[PDB]
Amino acid sequence: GFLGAAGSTMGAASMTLTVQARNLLSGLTVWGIKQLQARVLAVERYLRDQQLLGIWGCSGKLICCTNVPWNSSWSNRNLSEIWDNMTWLQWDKEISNYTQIIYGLLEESQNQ
């Protein structure tokens, strides 16, 4: 179920995106205020992610292809050892340095 493919390869975890997608929205006065803020923060995070996806041209999608070519300086591994011999937790730790450049490229490519 939820987070089930955290130890599986990147290819295997690409077929269960909806499981994580669903578990992000619903899954005295002092305590009442604290609980309300959590729900408001979850709604805000969801809306920010949705706005980013819509700006990138990927509104209402779980997998989205783009027109931005992959720079070889971001990673030199071939597709056989990325989608079949790697997990997303390891991939994030490697591409954490180039995330902002890729996001900016996506935005400026979609706008133009």
Add this chain to the structure above:
Amino acid sequence: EVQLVQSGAELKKAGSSVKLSCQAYGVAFSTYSFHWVRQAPGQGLEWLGGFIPLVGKPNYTNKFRGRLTITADESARTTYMELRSLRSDDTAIYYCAGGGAYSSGGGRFHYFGMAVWGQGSTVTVSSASTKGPSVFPLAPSSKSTSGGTAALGCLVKDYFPEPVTVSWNSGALTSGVHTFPAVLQSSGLYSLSSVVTVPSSSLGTQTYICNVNHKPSNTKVDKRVEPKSC
């Protein structure tokens, strides 16, 4: 209003490269379209290139593909044009123009032309070298007087390359001033003569000075014109 300022005249050699700059005042730089055009002496206009700095991908003419580069600098708000592999026909006046554009979505941009133009820069390539201008005062006399109006002026000889700017009384006098276009002699240098007709009564009371500037030779000469002593 919007204004464009360009660099000075340029003289180069065959096979070298030239760079020109154009600075804009009065608009937002990133969302304004800038274009580079050229005009050969005696021929029409030739749109070289143009782009919007925000998009970042300029457009070029297929004739000048591989020889022309257009770049921008938002910190200085200046657009640069680089032309490489100069040939004998590259001597011309280069203009920097600007225009406004809008977007209708999905990568579509619509333009309106070139409403703002620069003053232009003259680029010349030849085997000759720089030469300081020589100024000679065409002094008025009895032969130059007709119906109370006498003509005087200044002639410029032995200078290269173009251009040379001639003014009278630091621009105070403009009426009756005729500056004939420069011509090429067999010696390979240029020559011209700028004249002015003034009332004969002002010859003995008004002082006439012709100021000539030759920027490539960084020469500035102020020559006084008086009737020839007799």
